[PDB]
Design a protein around this ligand. Structure first.
Ligand code: PRZ
Ligand code: PRZ
Length: 132
């Protein structure tokens, strides 16, 4: 549900400010986060992939190679209002996109691709939120 996905994204984003400092990241990234769930919007900045990976890691959802920890990702979904069935769905999508996205040494870019694949799957389900 959109409503859930809205709360997830707001909460995934909360620690952005800490990552900064910790990464040297710019304001191109805030424009990418602000626009993320916009239909057809396309993330072009490498450094936004870096920021997602830093956020996910800080939430214990990511191993040091960029892959999803499925258990921890379920725990994060459930903490923010996803029931079981929605959470496991979110998980099957990230995992599916992990498998489909070309492998890449550049974790930041690979993370872009996964996050793009994910966003597209979520619009398809009619779950992408309107983030004011
Ligand atoms: C795990 O990452 C997430 N999980 C659920 C919802 N939103 C995101 C992130 C965004 C949009 C930055
Ligand atoms: C956990 O969220 C994530 N984990 C790894 C890479 N990308 C994201 C964003 C998604 C899944 C949209």
């Amino acid at each position: 549900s959109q409503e859930v996905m809205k709360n997830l994204s707001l909460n995934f984003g909360k620690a952005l400010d800490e990552c900064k400092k910790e990464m040297t990241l710019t304001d191109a990234i805030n424009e990418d986060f602000y626009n993320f769930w916009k239909e057809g919007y396309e993330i072009k900045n490498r450094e936004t992939g870096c920021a997602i990976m830093c956020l996910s890691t800080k939430l214990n959802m990511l191993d040091p190679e960029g892959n999803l920890h499925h258990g921890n990702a379920m725990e994060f979904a459930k903490k923010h209002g996803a029931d079981e069935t929605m959470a496991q769905q979110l998980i099957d999508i990230v995992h599916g996109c992990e498998k489909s996205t070309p492998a890449n040494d550049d974790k930041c870019i690979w993370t872009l691709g996964v996050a793009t694949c994910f966003k597209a799957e979520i619009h398809k389900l009619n779950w992408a939120p309107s983030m004011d």
